[PDB]
Amino acid sequence: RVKRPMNAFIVWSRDQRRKMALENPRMRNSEISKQLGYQWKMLTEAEKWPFFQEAQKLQAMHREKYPNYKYRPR
DNA sequence: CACTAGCATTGTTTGGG
DNA sequence: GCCCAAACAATGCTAGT
Structure with a gap:
């Protein structure tokens, strides 16, 4: 079962x-x-951007590996 | 020991009104 | 189109059956 x-x-x-x-x-x-939660909201945009890049790499590798995956809750 | 439901957070996506 | 609730990622447990 493929995770998010x-x-x-x-x-x-x-x-x-x-x-x-x-x-x-x-x-x-x-x-x-x-x-x-408090700490993250305290972070400037300039501090959080390496983590959005990493999230993007991860979503990209996800579609490489699971090209037909689609999200289905419940 | 096996469910599964919930607590906690944010961001993402979905699905209903 | 708008709005919204809510699943579910990781992590680290709980508590009920």
């Missing part, structure tokens, strides 16, 4: 989730998501 490709926030959140967890070892993971 990572958008830019997901791409950026992965390292940032681990680094928050190691520095705040008591927080629930659902509470790290909140902290990652």
Whole structure:
């Protein structure tokens, strides 16, 4: 079963989730998501663009590998 | 142990009104 | 066309059956 490709926030959140967890070892993971939300909204456009590029590469490789994939929720 | 449903985030896409 | 809700990507669990 073919999964969705990572958008830019997901791409950026992965390292940032681990680094928050190691520095705040008591927080629930659902509470790290909140902290990652505030931080992302704090990021300037100029800081987030490498992650949108990465998201694009990922959506592009997705269509290479799965040329007939289409998204079907529920 | 196996479901699956939910909590949490943003961005993307879908599907209904 | 507009609006909207909501699935679902990763990650890291929960809680119910």
